[PDB]
Design a protein around this ligand. Sequence first.
Ligand SMILES: [Mg+2]
Ligand SMILES: [Mg+2]
Ligand SMILES: [Mg+2]
Ligand SMILES: [Mg+2]
Ligand SMILES: [Mg+2]
Ligand SMILES: [Mg+2]
Ligand SMILES: [Mg+2]
Ligand SMILES: [Mg+2]
Ligand SMILES: [Mg+2]
Ligand SMILES: [Mg+2]
Ligand SMILES: [Mg+2]
Ligand SMILES: [Mg+2]
Ligand SMILES: [Mg+2]
Ligand SMILES: [Mg+2]
Ligand SMILES: [Mg+2]
Ligand SMILES: [Mg+2]
Ligand SMILES: [Mg+2]
Ligand SMILES: [Mg+2]
Ligand SMILES: [Mg+2]
Ligand SMILES: [Mg+2]
Ligand SMILES: [Mg+2]
Ligand SMILES: [Mg+2]
Ligand SMILES: [Mg+2]
Ligand SMILES: [Mg+2]
Ligand SMILES: [Mg+2]
Ligand SMILES: [Mg+2]
Ligand SMILES: [Mg+2]
Ligand SMILES: [Mg+2]
Ligand SMILES: [Mg+2]
Ligand SMILES: [Mg+2]
Ligand SMILES: [Mg+2]
Ligand SMILES: [Mg+2]
Ligand SMILES: [Mg+2]
Ligand SMILES: [Mg+2]
Ligand SMILES: [Mg+2]
Ligand SMILES: [Mg+2]
Ligand SMILES: [Mg+2]
Ligand SMILES: [Mg+2]
Ligand SMILES: [Mg+2]
Ligand SMILES: [Mg+2]
Ligand SMILES: [Mg+2]
Ligand SMILES: [Mg+2]
Ligand SMILES: [Mg+2]
Ligand SMILES: [Mg+2]
Ligand SMILES: [Mg+2]
Ligand SMILES: [Zn+2]
Lengths: 138, 208, 104, 99, 124, 83
Amino acid sequence: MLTDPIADMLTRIRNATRVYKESTDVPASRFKEEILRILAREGFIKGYERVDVDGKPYLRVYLKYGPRRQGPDPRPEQVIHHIRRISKPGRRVYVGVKEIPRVRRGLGIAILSTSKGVLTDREARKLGVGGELICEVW
Amino acid sequence: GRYIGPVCRLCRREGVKLYLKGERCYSPKCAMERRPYPPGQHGQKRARRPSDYAVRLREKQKLRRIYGISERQFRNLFEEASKKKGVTGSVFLGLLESRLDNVVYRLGFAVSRRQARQLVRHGHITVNGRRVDLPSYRVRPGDEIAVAEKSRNLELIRQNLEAMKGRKVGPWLSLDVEGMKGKFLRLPDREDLALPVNEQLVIEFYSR
Amino acid sequence: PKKVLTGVVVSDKMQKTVTVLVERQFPHPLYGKVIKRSKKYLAHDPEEKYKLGDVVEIIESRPISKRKRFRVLRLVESGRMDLVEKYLIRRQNYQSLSKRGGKA
Amino acid sequence: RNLSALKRHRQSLKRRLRNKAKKSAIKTLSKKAIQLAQEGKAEEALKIMRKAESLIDKAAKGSTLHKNAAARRKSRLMRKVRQLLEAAGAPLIGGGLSA
Amino acid sequence: PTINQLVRKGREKVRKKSKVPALKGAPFRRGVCTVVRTVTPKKPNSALRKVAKVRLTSGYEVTAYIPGEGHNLQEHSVVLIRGGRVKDLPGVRYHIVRGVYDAAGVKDRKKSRSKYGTKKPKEA
Amino acid sequence: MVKIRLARFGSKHNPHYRIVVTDARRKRDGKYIEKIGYYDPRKTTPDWLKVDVERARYWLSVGAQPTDTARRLLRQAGVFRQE
RNA sequence: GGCUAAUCCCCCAUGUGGACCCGCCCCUUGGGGUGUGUCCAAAGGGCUUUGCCCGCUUCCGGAUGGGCCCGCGUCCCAUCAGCUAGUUGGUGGGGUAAUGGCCCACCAAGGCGACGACGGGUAGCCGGUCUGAGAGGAUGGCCGGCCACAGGGGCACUGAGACACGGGCCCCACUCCUACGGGAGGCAGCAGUUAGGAAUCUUCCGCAAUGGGCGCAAGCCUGACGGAGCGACGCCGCUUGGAGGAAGAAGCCCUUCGGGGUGUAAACUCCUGAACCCGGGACGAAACCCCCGACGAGGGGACUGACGGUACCGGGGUAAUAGCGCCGGCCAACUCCGUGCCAGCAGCCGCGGUAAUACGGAGGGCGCGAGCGUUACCCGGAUUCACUGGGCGUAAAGGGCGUGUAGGCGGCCUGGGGCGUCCCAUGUGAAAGACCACGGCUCAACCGUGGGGGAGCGUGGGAUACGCUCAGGCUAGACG
RNA sequence: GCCUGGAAAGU
RNA sequence: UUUU
Ligand SMILES: [Mg+2]
Ligand SMILES: [Mg+2]
Ligand SMILES: [Mg+2]
Ligand SMILES: [Mg+2]
Ligand SMILES: [Mg+2]
Ligand SMILES: [Mg+2]
Ligand SMILES: [Mg+2]
Ligand SMILES: [Mg+2]
Ligand SMILES: [Mg+2]
Ligand SMILES: [Mg+2]
Ligand SMILES: [Mg+2]
Ligand SMILES: [Mg+2]
Ligand SMILES: [Mg+2]
Ligand SMILES: [Mg+2]
Ligand SMILES: [Mg+2]
Ligand SMILES: [Mg+2]
Ligand SMILES: [Mg+2]
Ligand SMILES: [Mg+2]
Ligand SMILES: [Mg+2]
Ligand SMILES: [Mg+2]
Ligand SMILES: [Mg+2]
Ligand SMILES: [Mg+2]
Ligand SMILES: [Mg+2]
Ligand SMILES: [Mg+2]
Ligand SMILES: [Mg+2]
Ligand SMILES: [Mg+2]
Ligand SMILES: [Mg+2]
Ligand SMILES: [Mg+2]
Ligand SMILES: [Mg+2]
Ligand SMILES: [Mg+2]
Ligand SMILES: [Mg+2]
Ligand SMILES: [Mg+2]
Ligand SMILES: [Mg+2]
Ligand SMILES: [Mg+2]
Ligand SMILES: [Mg+2]
Ligand SMILES: [Mg+2]
Ligand SMILES: [Mg+2]
Ligand SMILES: [Mg+2]
Ligand SMILES: [Mg+2]
Ligand SMILES: [Mg+2]
Ligand SMILES: [Mg+2]
Ligand SMILES: [Mg+2]
Ligand SMILES: [Mg+2]
Ligand SMILES: [Mg+2]
Ligand SMILES: [Mg+2]
Ligand SMILES: [Zn+2]
């Protein structure tokens, strides 16, 4: 069974990005969508859309990269470097606004799901309401 | 009893000038003036590339070896600076300068720091009026540092304070050579001093 | 104010009393994971009213006996073994795991 | 040695006795009060239940029985009296009870 | 380990074993002597070191080592243990305090003096 | 019987009390109910005796007898003056 | 055996009131009100004695202190896995201030345990304290809170309160008196002794201050406390001198026998002047009391300091303690001689068998300084028990394999509940400590004043994304 | 004493 | 044989 989808989705991404793929499907789930939504907004991905495969709902996720470098290994820089799951099943992690983290001394983001909704840290800090950390990303 | 002994020598061990004797350490005799090689037999022989530590240690001494203070006292001051606001390394200096014994020298009532220190344990100095015989005393900003209305008429003092006539004094300081008066204006900010030292090492030295 | 707990009625034998299993739940002090954990309270039921396997509210109360400081506030939900079962079985798991072993 | 305030002990026993006294009195009566109701002698049972009552409150006055201790005694007694007195009878002199 | 496992067993701490059962843990232990044998070094060392067997106050019979050039330790003298291993002689984990009781500190010792307990020589 | 007394807090040859409300049976410097002032026997500072009264008046309003010294200071701040 | 007073004990009265039984009403475990019945009070003393004072009696309430109960939290071993008969619950009863197998008679056959019962080990708990970047680890000494003990054990009396450190009774162990029958004891109060040990102080001064008991007060008691004394045991301040002074005495050391070193160090010149002496000399202490006003408010006056002839102020005034560790690398500081796997060093790696910067001595040099080294113990470094923050093909580490119990984990959609989770308000989180600012002692250590923070926990209200639960639905997992 | 770098043995 |  799919132990933890989210972990799974972030992984699917973590993976495809490394091989430098263009798109990358993922089993559809509101929440999963809600996450992506932020990724898109924060500018980590060329966005994404709903699709169908075998007849079941997936989420084409269009990946984003840098520009060809020079010299050895002309592989682009990953728009998305780091990107890990935090609160996994059997080890849920919860923070109260006062506890939300400084993802990458500023340059990163942290996706919290809150009673107000899924949202970036600063977003949270803004509405002032912590919740469940979901994934240091940067 | 802070050190006490072959001094114009530490000038030598540090390979630079600290001016411990005030005068003389100015004429053609501070030894560094022809004989800059440190003390001991192995003084003139070729030097060996020093260890990062080596340096660290040498620097702390140099600076602490100037104000002639105990590693103990010295340490507590730095530890105090660490604990405070502002570029710690600097602040340390501030505290260091506020040592009255220093100030009485900064205002040249005495030839050097040593001699200055003595004019204090002997009550010749004052702050806001009341007498004070504590070198370690820390002059606040706005205190007047004069001489003993009684002790004023001293050779050593007249001699020194007189030779201070028309002499320029530190910017964070000022004085009136007339009545032996003086005054602490502001904590000399890093730039104000010309200490031959990279105190940013004294910082490093106290870590390891 | 007087504490209040909820749980099922795992034991009935005692006359005028009921064992009330009360599952607590929380975050591990050091490792995080919310470990579930529990405790059995003997509620004082004066009319042998409540039956086995009924969720109830338990109220903190002035002593009825040694090992008995609670009265049954009210009935939350009626009937529902399973919970009792899980309980009865665990009591069974204990079987002989000492010289021979439990059973399965 | 000699810590002159041994007097307290000295005093202590002197009291112990005055106390022990008052109680024993209350008990023997209390018991008595019962056998009378127990059997059935109402007017008589009451009469004593009464003395008993007094004897008690009396004790309550000093550092003897004191407090609700007095009170318990009373209730516990006026209790059964009225009880065993239930198997016929009826407050013949309605001593201390009411109805 | 999984957290769940960590929750079930946690982490075993670590009982650090002593290395000087002078017992009572105290700084020093008083003793008396027995032997005053000599001992052969091990590994790549050769010599003869002043060793001593000692019946302690802690009801122990450990072997203590004697430092310094020469000594005066009898065979019924009250020495003082201070514990200190000795690479060369496996088995000797404690040193003596040359300078107390019947230790009569080393004689004619100029340098390291406080160690070897010897009062300061006068310069007439 | 609760009282209003003084509690030692200075150092050697250095005193400093606290005008405090406690229960007679406590140590002198032990746990009290409420601090309600402090007294400096040597007026080392331009201020050697604060007290407050709305409070003092309170404990007085209920038991809490005060040490004679307590009262002395305690009064010097007009805890009683009702002209 | 006899006499006798009282605020000692008792009976009768008055009953604001209050206690108890029965009934009733409001409340809701035994709270509040009410009716009949019953039951229950008291102490007197003083003077400025015809009114004031200290005091007594009964009831309601305030304040302070305390008992009992419950949720959560609190070390090691599973080479401790089953434990239990007052044991678990019931009814009646005893008992207490009061709930309760607290104790009893009877009836029931329960109660606890792997979420670790039971057994063994070890241990007062906490505020805090040391360490740490933090998370943590270690610790619980001084000071403050609670607990427990008073030669060992058991018991209760008297009291508002005790099962009572300087009260009582018995059994025990030990010491002393003993006319041998029977008795007297109990420093874990201050000080002091002896033993044990590596190790731990004066048979001190005083009640003046703070606090406490009794007393109307005067006052008495107060080894509590306030001070002194001995110990560098710790922390902080200070002295052993300042300025000058040869291209450089001597002695010691090294040498390419030119010289180089100790060294501006000394000698010596001049200045200041710790010690030590002489005079003055303290705050801490103004209340209780007394007089005026009424013994209130307010005012006046008097008495009273152990530390002390001390601190501090002025005068005079002498150049007047320096020691300890290390110098192969880690680690800052090198040369001669002695010695030859010896004597020895040593934290680790290691040095010594004839040129040793590692042994010992001297010169010199580094470090620190009335201190410096050593031993021991704790945290650190050590992501070396890894939650933050680790691993398991060959380095230590995958169970010989499966089946499956408990447990952990659990796909997509909608709605409800709101346990988890998050937000607001409020209560709590004593003082001291810690942190910041300011202030008092000449500085500091020390102290004072004020401020800010604080996890967790309770109450009220809210949010519903995620987790949980209930209810419906789906087919991509699984199964047929 | 001899030899070995120096030892142990051997001489 | 042992040791640099
Ligand atoms: Mg008496
Ligand atoms: Mg060797
Ligand atoms: Mg040595
Ligand atoms: Mg008679
Ligand atoms: Mg009476
Ligand atoms: Mg009457
Ligand atoms: Mg113990
Ligand atoms: Mg760490
Ligand atoms: Mg006992
Ligand atoms: Mg009493
Ligand atoms: Mg009693
Ligand atoms: Mg007791
Ligand atoms: Mg005693
Ligand atoms: Mg004693
Ligand atoms: Mg001894
Ligand atoms: Mg008094
Ligand atoms: Mg004292
Ligand atoms: Mg000089
Ligand atoms: Mg005064
Ligand atoms: Mg008096
Ligand atoms: Mg007056
Ligand atoms: Mg070096
Ligand atoms: Mg040699
Ligand atoms: Mg060495
Ligand atoms: Mg040497
Ligand atoms: Mg010192
Ligand atoms: Mg660690
Ligand atoms: Mg280890
Ligand atoms: Mg881990
Ligand atoms: Mg590893
Ligand atoms: Mg292997
Ligand atoms: Mg295998
Ligand atoms: Mg294997
Ligand atoms: Mg789910
Ligand atoms: Mg589940
Ligand atoms: Mg909730
Ligand atoms: Mg709070
Ligand atoms: Mg506090
Ligand atoms: Mg404070
Ligand atoms: Mg100040
Ligand atoms: Mg809702
Ligand atoms: Mg379903
Ligand atoms: Mg040989
Ligand atoms: Mg071989
Ligand atoms: Mg060898
Ligand atoms: Zn110089």
